[PDB]
Structure 1
């Protein structure tokens, strides 16, 4: 998993722990709309289509910027079930890089306060 974004921290953060973040599809100074989902029982992944945040790639194509490691919020599977404005720390949400195409999901399970 070379192409992927990650956040310095990975637990003991806070609701909107905007910390340093690097990595992504490893494009090249390309845009990488930040994303945040909630990985529960695997089959239950409530993505957060409210990330908004956007990270830019660096030469190589690796993102580099501060991403908000939200803690609690309202997530949604995708078209079946909805998480809800609840704590994500219970589902060890995750924050990764996202394109304007909504490529595959992330894999940065961070422990939110």
Structure 2
């Protein structure tokens, strides 16, 4: 089963909204980082470190947790580098689950 991700709600969001993030077809036993992202340049994605969560897939490859989304946030690169302000009203933000290798379900688009 190919890994899939679900975010509810995902559209018509307000800043500080708490969304339910669910994953399926994940690698059982593997921990996934649950964060809000935005592709800010070719090959460059910045995420929101101020609101993070992580969940571990069960024996069936499923997991779920909560994530507080932000209309705008101070974006950072996964290596700890500060990127800059990301405005999700203009940029195409997403919520994603990624393992230690950077793999996982396709990011889920969200809108404010």
Contact 2:8-2:21 at 8 Å conserved across structures: yes
What runs of 5+ residues in structure 2 fail to find an aligned partner? none
TM-superposed deviation, 1:26: 0.9
Report the CA distance shift for 1:36/1:86 in structure 2 as closer, same or farther (over 3 A): closer
CA RMSD of aligned residues (A): 3.3
State the TM-score, normalized to the length of structure 1. Answer: 0.70
Aligned residue-pair number: 112
State the alpha-carbon separation in 2 of the partners of residues 104 and 48 from structure 1.
Answer: 18
Residues 1:74 and 2:68 are matched in the alignment: no
Report the CA distance shift for 1:46/1:84 in structure 2 as closer, same or farther (over 3 A): same
Bigger shift: residues 49-58 or 88-97:
49-58
State the TM-score, normalized to the length of structure 2. Answer: 0.71
State the alpha-carbon separation in 1 of the partners of residues 64 and 110 from structure 2.
Answer: 18
Where in structure 1 do 4 or more consecutive aligned residues deviate above 6 Å?
A: 78-82
